Amino acid sequence: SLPDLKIEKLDEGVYVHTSFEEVNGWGVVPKHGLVVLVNAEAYLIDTPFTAKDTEKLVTWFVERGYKIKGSISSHFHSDSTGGIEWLNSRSIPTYASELTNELLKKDGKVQATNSFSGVNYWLVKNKIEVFYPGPGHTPDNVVVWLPERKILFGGCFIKPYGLGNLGDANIEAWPKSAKLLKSKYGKAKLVVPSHSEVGDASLLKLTLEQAVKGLNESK
Ligand SMILES: C[C@H](CS)C(=O)N1CCC[C@H]1C(=O)O
Ligand SMILES: [Zn+2]
Ligand SMILES: [Zn+2]
């Protein structure tokens, strides 16, 4: 029996959702996601692994009087995009980078309805920003920045302890992308990784260090 979906407040207008799956060859993997509230509207940062969890997550917010305005997926893997098919079926707007959509189509998965290309994208002006630091954990990975709180959702890019599965990784690119991310978001109050506990800006440094080590052990 896996743990039930968890929803907890991280900051004003910000909640973290945690979902769990048994992953072949990796054991039980926890996935952190965010829900960001603007007025009476709610935005999903990453979907839980499954439609069932995504439906539960949406319901929890709908019950509390919020309209689900949009969803954004950090990268193509199912821990970020699992709910897209369901969200699309409910006509709830879904967002991903053009690269992520290309990779999804490739993986035989349902694509986000809306896509953006380019480094910066403001899902909500002045409140939610998507940033692409370049290839790392995957070619398409992006981070989400909340300026009003200085909270960065690292997603699966942030890897303090180990890089994890390198199957889709760009090992050569990653240290450079990490350096770029650290320079841009060193100011961050909080960093929320996908697969590990919430932390301060130091997670950016650790990720860069891990990325360099991985490339080296790699040579
Ligand atoms: C469900 C995730 C996809 S990012 C996964 O398989 N793993 C494998 C180990 C932890 C985590 C990771 O690569 O970050
Ligand atoms: Zn991944
Ligand atoms: Zn992941």
Author numbering: 21 to 239
Quote the paper.
β-Lactam-containing compounds remain the most important antibiotics in clinical use, but their effectiveness is threatened by increasing resistance. β-Lactam resistance is most importantly mediated by serine- and zinc-dependent metallo-β-lactamases (SBLs and MBLs, respectively), which catalyze β-lactam hydrolysis. B1 MBLs (e.g., imipenemase [IMP], Verona integron-encoded MBL [VIM], and New Delhi MBL [NDM] types) are the most clinically relevant MBLs; these MBLs catalyze hydrolysis of almost all β-lactams, including the latest generations of cephalosporins and carbapenems. We report systematic studies on the inhibition of four clinically relevant MBLs (IMP-1, VIM-2, SPM-1, and NDM-1) and the model MBL BcII by the four captopril stereoisomers and both enantiomers of a captopril derivative, 1-(2-mercaptobenzoyl)pyrrolidine-2-carboxylic acid (d- and l-MBP).
We determined high-resolution crystal structures for d- and l-captopril in complex with IMP-1 (1.71- and 2.01-Å resolutions, respectively), VIM-2 (1.40- and 1.20-Å resolutions, respectively), and BcII (1.18- and 1.10-Å resolutions, respectively). For the IMP-1–d-captopril and IMP-1–l-captopril structures, the ligands were modeled and refined with 100% occupancy in chain A, but the residual density present in chain B was interpreted as too weak (<50% occupancy) to include in the model. In all cases, cysteine oxidation during crystallization could be prevented by the addition of tris(2-carboxyethyl)phosphine (TCEP) (except for IMP-1, for which cysteine oxidation in the absence of TCEP was not observed). In all MBL–l-captopril structures (including those with IMP-1), the carboxylate is positioned to interact with the conserved asparagine (Asn233) from the L10 loop. Second, the observation of a decreased number of hydrogen bonding/electrostatic interactions for l- over d-captopril generally reflects weaker inhibition. l-Captopril was observed to be more potent against IMP-1 than against the other MBLs tested, and its IC50 was only 3-fold higher than that of d-captopril. This observation of relatively potent inhibition of IMP-1 by l-captopril correlates with the observation that for IMP-1, but none of the other MBLs, the l-captopril carboxylate favors binding to Lys224IMP-1.
